[PDB]
């Protein structure tokens, strides 16, 4: 719904906000998105640097099968499966403790933004907050969201952090 007409007049008391046009927008945000990929490309680092190792005793054993006892490929390669497996299930580790990082970064994210909120709130003297998720046209002048975007910025820019663990359980 893109809007290329008039408004009605800004009504007093009513105010609109976007969480996660907020989020989007803000320098904290964007800061989140490049550290989880970041994280994301470590790990595909390094569970692609592990197959290759992988992939690369599979040829070894192959190569060699027409040479050693049965016995002894029989333990090689019951071995290498195992490890297989376990890349396998360091993968779905993986992706596990990357969407709790994700979550609690955001859950993080939104605290961060109470404090914005309330000073924006008390600014602009609201009677009410509206969610932009029910409102599909407004008079801008009604959408504090940016105002927030700013008071934020001004409170934080940045946010470390680093992959959540759950090997420990």
Same mark, same amino acid.
């Given at each position: 719904?893109?809007?290329?007409? &008039?408004? /009605? =007049?800004?009504?007093? /008391?009513?105010?609109?906000?976007?969480? =996660?046009? @907020?989020?989007?927008?803000?320098?904290?945000?964007?800061?989140?998105?490049?550290?989880?990929? &970041?994280?994301? $490309? *470590?790990?595909?680092?390094?569970?692609? /640097?592990?197959?290759? @190792?992988?992939? %690369?005793?599979?040829? +070894?054993?192959?190569?060699?099968? !027409?040479?050693?006892?049965?016995?002894?490929?029989?333990?090689?390669?019951? !071995?290498?499966? @195992?490890?297989? %497996?376990?890349?396998?299930?360091? /993968?779905?580790?993986? #992706?596990?403790?990357?969407?709790?990082?994700? $979550?609690?970064?955001?859950?993080?994210?939104? #605290?961060?933004? %109470? !404090? =914005?909120?309330? *000073?924006?709130? *008390?600014? $602009?003297?609201?009677?009410?907050?509206?969610?932009?998720?029910?409102?599909?046209? +407004?008079? =801008?002048?009604?959408?504090? !969201?940016?105002?927030?975007?700013?008071?934020?910025?001004?409170?934080?820019?940045?946010? &470390?952090?680093?992959?959540?663990?759950?090997?420990?359980?």
């Amino acid at each position: 719904l893109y809007f290329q007409g &008039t408004h /009605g =007049p800004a009504l007093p /008391g009513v105010c609109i906000f976007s969480s =996660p046009r @907020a989020v989007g927008s803000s320098l904290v945000g964007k800061a989140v998105d490049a550290r989880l990929k &970041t994280i994301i $490309q *470590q790990v595909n680092a390094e569970l692609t /640097g592990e197959r290759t @190792a992988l992939d %690369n005793e599979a040829k +070894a054993l192959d190569a060699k099968k !027409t040479t050693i006892a049965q016995d002894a490929l029989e333990q090689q390669a019951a !071995t290498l499966q @195992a490890k297989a %497996n376990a890349w396998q299930r360091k /993968g779905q580790l993986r #992706q596990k403790e990357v969407e709790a990082t994700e $979550q609690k970064a955001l859950s993080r994210v939104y #605290q961060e933004l %109470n !404090t =914005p909120i309330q *000073q924006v709130y *008390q600014a $602009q003297k609201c009677s009410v907050l509206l969610d932009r998720e029910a409102v599909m046209l +407004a008079n =801008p002048a009604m959408d504090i !969201t940016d105002a927030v975007v700013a008071a934020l910025d001004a409170r934080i820019k940045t946010l &470390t952090f680093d992959r959540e663990r759950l090997d420990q359980q």
